[PDB]
């Protein structure tokens, strides 16, 4: 939801074309009294309480909470035998069928999330195999997130990725309250 | 709009068995979008229900209403169609099983009144439906007689139970 923007919009009685004049005198006609033909009671009239977009849903959980969620997702995967640690993502071939057959033989479920340390240094073989698949998705370590982890039945992390995730997530437990955004220079950050 | 009445003359029954009673022929005919009121047309359709084809034609030939000529025209083509396409041997051996009027698609027009006021006038159309069944016209029901009343009254006395007990 945080990045949701709804583009739905309707017109109020003030924005519907026309509708200036009183359709008929207040009294004497025997009809119900009306001030404008574009009232929400009229066919073709404005919408009383419709959507008034574009509408933003932005909000931010505390940084520590978003970090803790990642920890829980990794623990759940390990506790339920859905986490597999690899030394590297290098395949013998770039054929997607090999990777598909490998998952079936190893009983890895229908979908597998493949996490590499960095986008630039992903092996070309795994890049070719995953590029041609739909349920086998390759992401860099900086792209890891709870939604993807829950959508995919199996999680595969490389050993460098494991060391990467421990450093980043455990930094949140031992850090001071910030004095200014962490993007700015600190004594001991980054690394 | 619905046009189911014209599809009832297209039902093919399977061949009858040797011992089964001969099935009477049934001919459905109608005229659509007649410029006439269904309310007024109902009276003419009511008149000929149960009549033989010849008796119905005689009654309609001497009626003063405009609908009578239209119904007579429909009845004659239905009678011709019964012998030509429905294997009816005798054209006189037909009777009005069903005859009714229906509402047609109508048009709206303005009727002017005084003081700048108006009304909405409907140009009325109607349908007429007829079913012809082969055979002599069914006999009318004899008026319930005193014997029948007494028998029914005593029957209700004899069906009378002791209520709200064992």
């Amino acid at each position: 939801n945080f990045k949701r923007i709804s583009y739905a919009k309707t017109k109020t009685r003030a924005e519907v074309r026309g509708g200036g004049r009183k359709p008929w005198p207040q009294k004497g006609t025997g009809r119900a009294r009306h001030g404008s033909i574009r009232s929400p009671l009229w066919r073709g009239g404005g919408v009383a309480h419709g959507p008034r977009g574009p509408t933003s849903y932005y909000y931010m959980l505390p940084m520590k909470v978003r970090a803790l969620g990642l920890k829980v997702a990794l623990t759940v995967k390990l506790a339920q035998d859905d986490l597999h640690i690899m030394d590297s993502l290098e395949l013998p071939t770039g054929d997607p069928q090999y990777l598909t057959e490998l998952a079936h033989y190893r009983r890895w479920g229908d979908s597998v999330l493949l996490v590499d340390l960095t986008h630039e240094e992903m092996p070309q073989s795994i890049v070719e195999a995953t590029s041609r698949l739909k349920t086998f998705n390759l992401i860099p370590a900086v792209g890891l997130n709870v939604h993807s982890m829950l959508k995919h039945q199996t999680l595969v992390l490389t050993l460098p990725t494991v060391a990467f995730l421990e450093d980043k997530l455990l930094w949140q437990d031992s850090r001071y309250r910030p004095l200014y955004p962490f993007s700015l220079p600190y004594s001991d950050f980054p690394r | 709009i619905s046009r189911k009445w014209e599809k009832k003359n297209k039902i093919v029954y399977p061949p009858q068995l040797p011992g089964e009673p001969r099935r009477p022929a049934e001919i459905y005919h109608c005229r659509r979008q007649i410029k006439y009121s269904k309310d007024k047309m109902w009276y003419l359709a009511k008149l000929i229900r149960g009549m033989s084809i010849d008796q119905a034609l005689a009654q309609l030939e001497f009626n003063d209403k405009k609908g009578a000529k239209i119904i007579k025209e429909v009845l004659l083509e239905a009678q011709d169609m019964a012998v030509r396409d429905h294997n009816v041997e005798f054209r006189s051996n037909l009777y009005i099983a069903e005859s009714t009027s229906g509402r047609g698609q109508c048009l709206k027009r303005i009727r002017y009144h005084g003081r700048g006021r108006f009304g909405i006038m409907e140009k009325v159309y109607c349908h007429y439906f007829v079913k012809l069944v082969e055979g002599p016209p069914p006999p009318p029901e004899p008026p319930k007689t005193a014997v029948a009343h007494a028998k029914e009254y005593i029957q209700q006395l004899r069906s009378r139970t002791i209520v709200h007990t064992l």
Binding site: - | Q105, L107, R117
Partner: peptide
């Protein structure tokens, strides 16, 4: 008592002009 008159309102013509 001030004269009170309510003039008649004509409906749109097309509503009584449609043909088959």
């Amino acid at each position: 008592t001030k004269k009170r008159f309510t003039p008649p309102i004509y409906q749109p013509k097309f509503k009584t002009e449609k043909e088959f």
